[PDB]
Symmetry: C2
Subunit: 96 residues, 2 copies
């Protein structure tokens, strides 16, 4: 949400805390970057980042990106896992 992505905490504060308070951090994804028009001059200065999640933080991502950057499947788009679209019978006694 490049329009509405904040920068909540600078790292100078993740080293000052009572070790028992959970911060909240806003990660920004851009893996589905369109390849801009073949007119713009390539950039000259990049963007930095400091924090890095040490483990997996994506269990609640059903789908990432509905685009078509080349009018086909974007080579890193993620459709949902077949596990979450199962409709099996129920034991007629206790739902479940």
């Amino acid at each position: 949400d490049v329009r509405q992505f904040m920068n909540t905490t600078k790292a100078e504060t993740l080293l000052i805390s009572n070790k028992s308070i959970v911060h909240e951090i806003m990660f920004f994804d851009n893996a589905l970057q369109p390849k801009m028009s073949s007119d713009t001059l390539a950039l000259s200065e990049a963007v930095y980042r400091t924090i890095w999640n040490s483990s997996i933080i994506t269990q609640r991502i059903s789908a990432r990106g509905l685009m078509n950057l080349e009018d086909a499947r974007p080579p890193e788009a993620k459709i949902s896992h077949q596990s979450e679209l199962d409709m099996g019978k129920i034991d007629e006694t206790s739902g479940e």
Copy 2:
């Protein structure tokens, strides 16, 4: 000048003339078309 390119004469008039009058015609070039962003859906109908 896609912004300011007219369409002066339709061909139905280049066949009606006294053979001695010079028309003026505006040709439009676009050979240096940028290849637009790899996001837009390819077009469906061309230009004649």
